[PDB]
Every structure is written in structure tokens, then in C-alpha cells.
Design a protein around this ligand. Structure first.
Ligand SMILES: Nc1ncnc2c1ncn2[C@@H]1O[C@H](COP(=O)(O)OP(=O)(O)O)[C@@H](O)[C@H]1O
Length: 226
């Protein structure tokens, strides 16, 4: 629920964590109705294996440090031995020991085959306040050039209108290997609710947001706070 989200953000700030990653933001997103790929934490290659055994294979491993924007992501790990070899490779890759690793992110592999990858960024405009920007999942991000733009507070009616116009302008695809407009719109309203309620959030980046008809799932999430 929400009150836990504020306490989680305030305590992260007090501890000096100004950038929260996918495992840290998962309860905050869920308290606004948004789905995140379950994401666990491994300090040891022995722990990464243990997590992988529970999740079920295949698994991904990503380095939990405030550093990467080299190595870091290891996908399609299908066996306990592959997890251990990959965990040792990233843990030992470390390349000075000055990063506070805490450990490594472990998560199940998502079915991306027939799904669209979107991106949702929230940045602050000096005049207009928080801007929600929705575009296609990819490294190149020209927000002014190729993005749907919403200003909180967003209602479902305006969210749907902005998504439809974004499809018509070819900024977002109508479908690929059928984009549920009602679900993309609902997601934008949830982002808007979160931003309205949590002005601590300086930046929010869902990269990518996976679209599989009815289900929209955030695969990686970064939350900058101050
Ligand atoms: N758990 C996962 N399941 C499926 N695909 C994933 C998972 N995690 C990351 N990916 C894929 O890895 C790619 C992202 O690679 P990454 O190096 O993290 O990009 P960036 O440098 O932009 O963060 C994307 O294509 C994404 O779809």
C-alpha cells in the first residue's frame, strides 16, 4: 500500500541511496498497481544458484551496483553450473573493488517473442513539472522527436486519447507479432498516480516495459530520488 511506499522512499534517502533499481522499487510500483518482474538479490555465486533453483530456469543475472549505464547482463542461464560460472564471472569481473556491489540481480527470463517492448520515462520540466514520456523500447531515445507526452494528473480518458494519437502519429506501433490501448492507458494513469503521490521521485525509467496484450510488465526500473 502507499504509506509503505513513502516510508521506503524516505528511508532510502536517509541512507543516501539516490538511485533505486528494480528489486528496490518493486513494492513501490505494486502499491500503485504496476507489475514488475520478480527480482532477487545475490551476494554470493552460491546465493545466485540458490535463487535460480527456486525461480526455475532460464534465468538472467545483472550486476547490482550504482555503476553501469561492459559485461553486467548474462541472459539465458539454463543450468545451476551456468549460473555459478556467470556469477563468478561478474563477481570476479568486479574493475576495482571500489563499487559497493551488495551483489547481483537474479530474475527469470521473460517471454519476449511476440511482445512489444516500450519505454516509459518521467522527467521534470522547469515550467511544466513532471512529464511522462512513452516511446518504443530501444537505446535511441529522442523524447522531443519521437515520444507521447503526458502531464500528471492523467485520467483514463485523456490517457487513451494520447495513446491513440501516438499510434496514429506512428510514434508507438498499433500492434506487432495487438497493443491493448486500455492497458497501456491504465499503466500511464498508474505512473501518474505514483508521480503525483511521490514528489521525492526525480526520475523514473521503465526500460523496457513489456507489452503482451493484457499484461504490461516492467522488466528493469530505475528510480532516482532526492
Ligand atoms: N529478465 C529478462 N528477460 C528477458 N529479457 C531481458 C531480461 N533482462 C534483460 N533483458 C533484455 O536485455 C536487453 C537489455 O540489455 P541491457 O544491457 O540491460 O540494456 P541497457 O544497457 O539499455 O540497460 C533488452 O533487450 C531486454 O529485453
Amino acid at each position: 500500500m502507499t504509506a509503505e511506499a513513502h516510508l521506503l522512499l524516505q528511508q532510502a534517502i536517509a541512507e543516501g541511496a539516490t538511485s533505486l533499481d528494480t528489486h528496490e522499487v518493486q513494492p513501490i510500483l505494486q502499491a500503485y498497481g504496476m507489475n514488475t518482474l520478480p527480482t532477487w538479490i545475490a551476494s554470493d555465486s552460491t546465493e545466485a544458484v540458490h535463487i535460480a533453483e527456486q525461480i526455475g530456469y532460464p534465468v538472467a543475472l545483472k550486476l547490482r551496483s550504482p555503476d553501469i549505464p561492459v559485461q553486467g547482463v548474462m541472459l539465458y542461464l539454463r543450468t545451476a553450473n551456468e549460473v555459478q560460472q556467470a556469477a563468478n564471472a561478474i563477481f570476479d569481473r568486479v574493475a576495482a573493488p571500489q563499487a559497493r556491489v551488495h551483489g547481483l540481480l537474479v530474475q527469470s527470463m521473460a517471454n519476449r517473442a511476440g511482445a512489444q517492448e516500450l519505454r516509459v520515462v518521467v522527467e521534470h520540466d522547469p515550467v511544466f513539472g513532471p512529464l511522462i514520456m512513452l516511446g518504443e523500447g530501444a537505446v535511441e531515445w529522442r523524447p522531443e522527436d519521437q515520444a507521447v507526452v503526458a502531464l500528471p494528473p492523467l485520467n483514463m480518458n485523456l490517457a487513451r486519447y494520447l495513446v491513440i494519437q501516438g499510434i496514429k502519429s506512428k510514434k508507438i506501433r498499433a500492434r506487432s507479432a495487438p497493443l491493448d490501448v486500455a492497458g497501456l492507458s491504465q499503466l500511464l494513469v498508474q505512473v501518474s498516480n505514483l508521480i503525483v503521490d511521490c514528489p521525492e521521485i526525480q526520475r523514473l525509467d521503465i526500460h523496457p516495459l513489456l507489452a503482451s496484450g493484457s499484461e504490461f510488465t516492467a522488466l528493469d526500473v530505475t528510480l532516482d530520488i532526492s
